[PDB]
Amino acid sequence: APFHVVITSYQLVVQDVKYFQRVKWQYMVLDEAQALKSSSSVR
DNA sequence: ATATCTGACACGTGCCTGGAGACTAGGGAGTAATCCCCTTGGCGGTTAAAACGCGGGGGACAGCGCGTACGTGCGTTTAAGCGGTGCTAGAGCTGTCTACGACCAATTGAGCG
């Protein structure tokens, strides 16, 4: 891949997923993952 | 009775709208020089203005009759939902060419002879 690691936040990712899925990743890093505690969330 | 629901009620960040600050430099505001203008104002070939004598036809009937109105028949009109699924705008991105910038020639207006 031409550029390696991308830095993001949950408010962007829940809208931008359609763009991010245009590129594959080897590994996912998910920081303060308690942001995902609600399975009811759109996030 | 109980699981768990629908507010209460708030700060998360997104979006764009919307304001004010400090800069350049585009252009607006101040001015003469001077011209050339809107304007004032007498001139006589030409038509607004109104009678008299008069021509073209406006005016008020009688009633014939080629069309006009009602409003129900009856068979042809669009309604109407909701199946599939191609079109359609979003929208992400070029891949340039096309109209709009930067440097300087043919043709014009100004000067007066």
UniProtKB/Swiss-Prot annotation:
Tell me the domain of life: Eukaryota
Q: What is the effect of changing E32Q?
A: Abolishes DNA-dependent ATPase and nucleosome remodeling activities
Question: Where expressed (tissues)?
Answer: According to PubMed:10574462, widely expressed. According to PubMed:16298340, specifically expressed in brain, liver and pancreas.
Task: Enumerate the subcellular locations listed in this protein's record, separating them with semicolons.
Answer: Cytoplasm; Nucleus; Cytoplasm, Cytoskeleton, Spindle; Chromosome
A further note on this protein reads: Although the ATP-dependent helicase activity displayed by the INO80 complex requires INO80 ATPase activity, it is likely that the helicase function is carried out by the other components of the complex, RUVBL1 and RUVBL2, and not by INO80 itself.
Quote the subunit structure annotation.
Component of the chromatin remodeling INO80 complex; three different complex modules assemble on different domains of INO80. Interacts with DDB1. Interacts with transcriptional repressor protein YY1; the interaction recruits the INO80 complex to YY1 target genes. Interacts with YY1AP1. Interacts with tubulin alpha. (Microbial infection) Interacts with Epstein Barr virus (EBV) lytic switch protein BZLF1; this interaction participates to the activation of early lytic viral genes by BZLF1.
**Function statement:** ATPase component of the chromatin remodeling INO80 complex which is involved in transcriptional regulation, DNA replication and DNA repair. Binds DNA. As part of the INO80 complex, remodels chromatin by shifting nucleosomes. Regulates transcription upon recruitment by YY1 to YY1-activated genes, where it acts as an essential coactivator. Involved in UV-damage excision DNA repair. The contribution to DNA double-strand break repair appears to be largely indirect through transcriptional regulation. Involved in DNA replication.
Its domain comment says: The DBINO region is involved in binding to DNA.
- Record-stated family: Belongs to the SNF2/RAD54 helicase family.
By what name is this protein known?
Chromatin-remodeling ATPase INO80
Species in which this protein is naturally found: Homo sapiens (Human)
Q: Which gene encodes it?
A: INO80
Q: Which residues of the full protein are shown?
A: 622 to 664 of 1556
